[PDB]
Amino acid sequence: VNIEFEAYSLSDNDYDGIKKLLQQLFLKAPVNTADVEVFGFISLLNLTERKGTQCVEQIQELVLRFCEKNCEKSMVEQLDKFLNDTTKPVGLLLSERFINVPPQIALPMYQQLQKELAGAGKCYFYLLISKTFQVTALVSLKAGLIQSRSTLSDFQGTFMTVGIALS
Amino acid sequence: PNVLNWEQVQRLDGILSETIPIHGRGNFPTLELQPSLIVKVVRRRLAEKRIGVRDVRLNGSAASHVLHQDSGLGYKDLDLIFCADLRGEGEFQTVKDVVLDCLLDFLPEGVNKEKITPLTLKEAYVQKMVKVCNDSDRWSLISLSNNSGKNVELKFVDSLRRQFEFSVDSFQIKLDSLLLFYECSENPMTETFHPTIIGESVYGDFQEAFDHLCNKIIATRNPEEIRGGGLLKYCNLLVRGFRPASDEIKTLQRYMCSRFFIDFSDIGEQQRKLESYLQNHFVGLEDRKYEYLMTLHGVVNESTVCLMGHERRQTLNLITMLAIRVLAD
């Protein structure tokens, strides 16, 4: 099972709105303590569980809806439901066991996901906006479902979500 | 039976020989692409990587446009479906690679191709990239961008559950006859010398679907793939002049209402999907914006026989307000 979505056609405020969407998600979870912009999360999932597959049905549906023609300004609103609707699998999975790691933890996780995504078992769910500048040279929204190698360092659990915030 | 006539073929040859501007971000030229060239070079370069391709086809509005100009659905976007059993070996990635190395060759002369990575081509010209390998579905997508609105989508489909919505978007027109014509003859296309091209429909018979597109008839099958947009899609045809055929829209016209309420339970949710739909489909068209909300109004009212008014009354009011706010401006 593989689902991968990339979009390089976001507007500056589409990015800026999603960044606010992700930031409230960071504030709502417990916080742990022990150029380019990147913000998002990497959620580990188990596909033999009802919760694992019930999430995929919503994730797969969101990507299908993102594949529509004039569906660009709706990205900010469709994501508002997606990750904040606790009456739904993905919005509920992000309210439970969401953890905020410092950037020294997040950068290794981002970089391995960037490696695992480039070259053709643990099901990972990621949503990742990114900006490259001052000005804005490119804005990218990547989000997908992949089965790969360990990005977590045994430090993450199943249905545990890890926050990404790189600046 | 399925063979396009000299008019329909002329329409097809025109849109596949158009030169479409494919704009690039930052320090990158604009790409001028002929859809027929994309089909050739992609299929040849794919073949050089021992990746097979069954056929190449045209989809949605452009297909409906070649069969009937007057339908009004319009030729706005070009959608090219490459039907290929991409079974294993990460063939979905080599497809991604081949398309990117075709984008490199289409570049204008005078570019130092050595600094151009595949990734820089991606970030320059690509607008969307989607890959789906879940259950029965195996398919990929590379949406090329154009600043002027046109959208040149390249779809690579092994298997896809639902390939249509209504009868008038179901047509798919094979292109292999047309491409072989250009290689074989130096002579141009005439009313007697034109290729034999076969139209097909992913919903039942081509003759049934063609008569619906010609008489402006809203018909569909397998409504279990309906969505909240299904109701909205239904009205978009109805206001463009399309009409139902009077054959048990009873459960259907309730399902679209039923599925639109479920998908959009909040009053705020409904007002945002409606406001978005109006501007993303009828920009500047405030006469068609009004007439849309009026058709959507009447459909929801007469079709939703649902006894409960929590969804009906509040939904019905959002349509009335927006119809007035559109009118009074």
Author numbering:
A (entry chain B): 57 to 90, 121 to 206, 214 to 226, 289 to 322
B (entry chain A): 63 to 391
Task: Copy out sentences from the published article reporting this entry, exactly as the authors wrote them.
The FAM46 (also known as TENT5) proteins are noncanonical poly(A) polymerases (PAPs) implicated in regulating RNA stability. Unexpectedly, our structures of the FAM46A/BCCIPα and FAM46C/BCCIPα complexes show that, despite sharing most of the sequence and differing only at the C-terminal portion, BCCIPα adopts a unique structure completely different from BCCIPβ. A helix-loop-helix segment in BCCIPα inserts into the active site cleft of FAM46, thereby inhibiting the PAP activity.
The FAM46A/BCCIPα-ΔL complex yielded better crystals. The following description of the FAM46A/BCCIPα structure will refer to this higher-resolution structure. The strand at the outer edge of the active site cleft of FAM46A (residues 189 to 196) packs against strand β1 in BCCIPα in an antiparallel fashion, integrating the β sheets in the two proteins into one extended β sheet. Strand β1 in BCCIPα and the edge β strand in FAM46A form seven backbone hydrogen bonds to join the β sheets in the two proteins together. However, CPB1 of Plk4 leaves the active site in FAM46C unoccupied, and its binding does not affect the PAP activity of FAM46 (5). Lys155 at the tip of the loop between helices B and C in BCCIPα sticks deep into the active site and makes a direct interaction with the catalytic residues Asp141 and Glu215. Most of the residues in FAM46A involved in the binding interface are conserved in other FAM46 family members, which underlies the interaction of BCCIPα with all the FAM46 proteins.
